[PDB]
Amino acid sequence: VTAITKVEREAVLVCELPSFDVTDVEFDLFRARESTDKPLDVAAAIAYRLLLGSGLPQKFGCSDEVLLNFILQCRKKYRNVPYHNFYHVVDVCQTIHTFLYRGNVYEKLTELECFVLLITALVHDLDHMGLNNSFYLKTESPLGILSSASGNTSVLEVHHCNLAVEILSDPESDVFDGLEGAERTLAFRSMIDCVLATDMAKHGSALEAFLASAADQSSDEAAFHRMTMEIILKAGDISNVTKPFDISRQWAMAVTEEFYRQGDMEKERGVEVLPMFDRSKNMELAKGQIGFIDFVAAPFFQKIVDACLQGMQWTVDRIKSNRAQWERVLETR
Ligand SMILES: [Mg+2]
Ligand SMILES: [Zn+2]
Numbered sequence: 001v002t003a004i005t006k007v008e009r010e011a012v013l014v015c016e017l018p019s020f021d022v023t024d025v026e027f028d029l030f031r032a033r034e035s036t037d038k039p040l041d042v043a044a045a046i047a048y049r050l051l052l053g054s055g056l057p058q059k060f061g062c063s064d065e066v067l068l069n070f071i072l073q074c075r076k077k078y079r080n081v082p083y084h085n086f087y088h089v090v091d092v093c094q095t096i097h098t099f100l101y102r103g104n105v106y107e108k109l110t111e112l113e114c115f116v117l118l119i120t121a122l123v124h125d126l127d128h129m130g131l132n133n134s135f136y137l138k139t140e141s142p143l144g145i146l147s148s149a150s151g152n153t154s155v156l157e158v159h160h161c162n163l164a165v166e167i168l169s170d171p172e173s174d175v176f177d178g179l180e181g182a183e184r185t186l187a188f189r190s191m192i193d194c195v196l197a198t199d200m201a202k203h204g205s206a207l208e209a210f211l212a213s214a215a216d217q218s219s220d221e222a223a224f225h226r227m228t229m230e231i232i233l234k235a236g237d238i239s240n241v242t243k244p245f246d247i248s249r250q251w252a253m254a255v256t257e258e259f260y261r262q263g264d265m266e267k268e269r270g271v272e273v274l275p276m277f278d279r280s281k282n283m284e285l286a287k288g289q290i291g292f293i294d295f296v297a298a299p300f301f302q303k304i305v306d307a308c309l310q311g312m313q314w315t316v317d318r319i320k321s322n323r324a325q326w327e328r329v330l331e332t333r
Contacts, residue, residue, distance in 0.1 A: 001076075003172060004069040011038070012068060015045035022049050025098050025314060029091050030250050040075060043090045047071050047122060050097050056115040061178020069173040074122045077163055083251075083258040084128035091251075092236040093121035099232055104311035108228050112183060113190065117229055119175055120191045121236060123164035124198055128156060130258045131265070133199065138271045154199040161192050190229055197230040198237050206230055207300060214308040231304055235312075241289065241297045242315040245325050252289055256282075286326040286333075293323045 020032055032046065033039040048068055051057055057067050078086035096117055100106040106114055133155045136144035147155045165188075168174045176187045197206050210231040213219040240251040263277030275281050282288075301315045 001073060001166060001170060001173075003170075004072045008072050009065070009068050011041050012044040012048060012072070015042050017042070017045060017049065020046075022046050022094060023053065023097060023101065025102055026244055027094060027098075028244070028247055029087060029094065030247060033087065040086065043086055044068075044071050044075055047090050047093055050094055051118055054097065054101075054114065054118060056111060056118065057175065059111060060115055060176070062175045066171075066173060066177065067175060070119075070167065070175045071122065073167045073170075073173045074126065077126045077167075079127065079129060081128060081130035081258055082261070083255045084125045084130055089122050089125055092124065092233075092239070093118055095239045095242075096121050096232060096236040099235060099309075099312055102311070103309060103314075105228070105232060105309055108308075109225060112179075112187065113225060113229055116187050116190050117194070117232060120164075120194050120233060123167070123191070124160055124195045124233065124237070125156075126160045126163040126167075128160075131262050132156070133201070135262055135266065138266075139269050153201065154196055157196050157199045161195050164191065164195070190226060193226060194230050194233040198234060203234075203296070206234060207303065211303060211307050214304075228308075235301070235304065235315075238297055238300065239315070241293055241322055242301065242318045244318075245322050248289075248322055249285070252285060256285065256288070286329040290323060290326050290330075293319055293326075298323070 015036070015038070017032070019035075021027060029043075029046070032042055036042055048071055051067055051071075052064065057064075074089070075086050078084075078089065100109075100114055100117065109117075133147075133153060135141070136155045137148065137153065138144075143155050143159065147153060147158065152158055168176060168188075171177050176184055179187055196202075206227075210227045213224045213227050240255075241248055243251070259277045260279045263273045263279060266273045266277065276288075298316070298319050301312070301319060305312050305316055
């Protein structure tokens with residue numbers, strides 16, 4: 001891949017982020033994007049400050065320059081789609097920072113694992129096209145065919161991992177270059193395991209495995225660490241409903257539009273369109289959010305908090321509160 005220039009680095013370094021506390025659970029990435037005409041540079045600055053403020057890169061021999069190169073190599077590989085763009089992965093990164101440090105989940109992990117998590121947030125959707133795994137499989141796209149033939153259905157997640165590995169092979173953007181031996185292996189394997197675990201087809205089993213391990217005082221420690229990392233990256237990925245209502249609503253709109261574009265492309269392809277992905281059918285953002293809250297997000301956050309992650313109780317509170325607010329939208333319609 002092409003090297004990062006001093007001009008690119010400087011365009012990020014000049015962003016000063018006045019008024020913003022990036023470590024805060026109420027942090028608003030949408031408001032940060034509007035605040036300049038260089039939203040991509042602000043987003044990179046947010047990531048850079050999060051990682052530096054953690055104190056972690058320094059401890060693992062990752063210089064400020066390599067860190068920022070990495071951030072910019074990641075940014076290059078995100079596309080202009082409505083939801084799975086660079087702002088999403090910076091959001092996931094920021095949210096995971098709150099789960100670790102505001103939610104005290106850092107206590108369950110080594111410093112290396114915290115570092116790997118914040119880094120993995122930035123790589124976990126690399127080169128997403130706004131199309132889900134199902135699109136590629138249903139349409140018999142070349143990547144779908146390769147995934148079927150090679151035995152994995154996680155088309156996107158494997159692709160994201162490939163691109164992460166390519167970014168890290170260049171020592172100028174290898175945030176893990178200061179590691180050796182078992183630590184270096186652990187960083188790569190845990191990053192990869194986490195990305196593969198974000199495939200929502202694996203949602204139920206990843207959750208159950210985490211909960212089984214957390215309830216077992218004799219669980220293998222290394223396995224529990226690994227599952228905690230997986231569940232935190234997953235938690236970040238479905239954390240939209242845990243944010244202040246208006247932030248949550250803006251996310252929901254962005255995802256809804258991405259899905260609608262997938263459904264438009266499925267129509268042109270002559271393949272099946274699910275109701276959720278079909279523009280022609282929906283009227284109700286509130287019912288979708290309530291549905292998602294009830295069947296996916298609230299049980300997930302409730303169960304992991306009760307099992308183990310007590311410090312993240314606010315996620316459950318905000319989901320409750322956001323749901324009540326969507327019920328008010330319905331009641332007054
Ligand atoms: Mg993904
Ligand atoms: Zn994601």
